[PDB]
Ligand binder design. Sequence first.
Ligand code: GLC
Ligand code: GLC
Lengths: 269, 270
Amino acid sequence: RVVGVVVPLIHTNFADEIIKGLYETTISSGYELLITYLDEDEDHQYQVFQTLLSRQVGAVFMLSLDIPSWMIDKLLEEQISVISLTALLSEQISAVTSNEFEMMNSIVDYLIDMGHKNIALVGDTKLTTNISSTRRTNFIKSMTDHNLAYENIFLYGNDHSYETGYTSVTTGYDINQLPFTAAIATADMVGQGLINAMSDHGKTVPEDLSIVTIDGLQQTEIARPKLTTVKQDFPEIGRIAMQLFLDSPQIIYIPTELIQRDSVLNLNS
Amino acid sequence: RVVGVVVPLIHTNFADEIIKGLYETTISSGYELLITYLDEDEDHQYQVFQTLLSRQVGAVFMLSLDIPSWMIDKLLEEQISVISLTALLSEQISAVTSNEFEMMNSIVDYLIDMGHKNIALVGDTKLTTNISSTRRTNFIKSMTDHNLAYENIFLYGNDHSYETGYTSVTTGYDINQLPFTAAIATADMVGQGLINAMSDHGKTVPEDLSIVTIDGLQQTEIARPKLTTVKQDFPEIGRIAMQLFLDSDEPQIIYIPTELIQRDSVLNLN
Ligand SMILES: OC[C@H]1O[C@H](O)[C@H](O)[C@@H](O)[C@@H]1O
Ligand SMILES: OC[C@H]1O[C@H](O)[C@H](O)[C@@H](O)[C@@H]1O
């Protein structure tokens, strides 16, 4: 009675929170949890798969979004259950996730209510050949649904790192003449990068830039000012996913919450 | 051709860095890496052990200080190599670690050179029945080796959390009249807690409190002020532990060097 979890070698702190939930449910049901890491090297990825097959796992939980199709097919073809978390990896399998459009729309709704019109999405905003640009597309859809235009929509960045947040307002835009009043950060660390870049250049959040992040992990509480954030319930994603395996395709959505803290200015005030 | 790594459920981010090192050496030697978590429940611990020998691991790397003796013994008795990382778990096994006294002594030496005399250790400072209070003991030894006295030595905390750092100078001591001028934080997040507690109560680091942390991970770079820190080479610890296993067919301790990185969180009082 073993289940596997595949975690990217490069991941936000959210993996540990998902794993805490998976672990709670595996322990109480008589299963053990094996954790394995996945790099972007096809040959190493295959070695790993032989390690999932050869520990005769009953299920594999995927957190990545960057999993090769042959891995999912090979696992399913061995009668192993495959369930993806925080993303919809394949038509063929079930997923447990926060609802991406609802998260994004909750932020845009809020920032517009707070008087913002010119808004940036900062973090993982790139277009690629094989991976959906989920947040980029949802941001643009939500902004346009709220009757804002292309001229109000700003994008920056290739990943969820602190560095991307930091560079967005140093190399990306003119920190002394920012064309947006608010930034939606695709992960908490991007938000911290923004805070520090502003502070390091003698500016202050939220007076000089409002920020909202997605994930709502510890860093949003450690930041000064404390970051307004859409908090995901990562442990619940894990628990619900394991329970889905135990009870046996579909998509199950776990709700999120926009937590209002100290990083947004009311421009109507 | 598999090795296992046992990680505590409650861990600083040092584990990931060790795992990065382990992984690079396993990859290039044709081994695969199984990661398992360990909680405080003896019955769950035994299941984890059953998962380790049933997956026929050649070696098990231990990161915790809290592993039961019976697990180490049962693994060794199955002819599985056991090596501990960042801690010397048993006299029966090899270990790869930063040198704890050298780390602590380097920090105390620096703080005293910078004019500090009244110094706190904040973080995991508790005495227990079964786990050596390594940092507490080394702090005290170093302070007394430098001819300071018990009246100069302050302690606070039971763990390496942000909350322990934050609470140390708010509910542990009087934030308005701290009896120490510098705090040695046993983990980076403790240092972050200290910075925030000071900032939230109208004070500023380092003007009102100097801080040095142990570990030197990303939090020390994103903190403001940036934290002066003893940086451990966690990936090197991981690589060397795996290399020890690969090179083996008695038990040794291999010390991995550290370095004190001076940033923005210490004031010279002289
Ligand atoms: O951590 C930032 C993001 O990482 C991954 O893309 C997850 O799918 C997403 O839920 C998370 O917000
Ligand atoms: O992260 C704080 C401490 O945690 C663990 O106890 C490690 O053994 C130690 O090396 C580290 O400094």
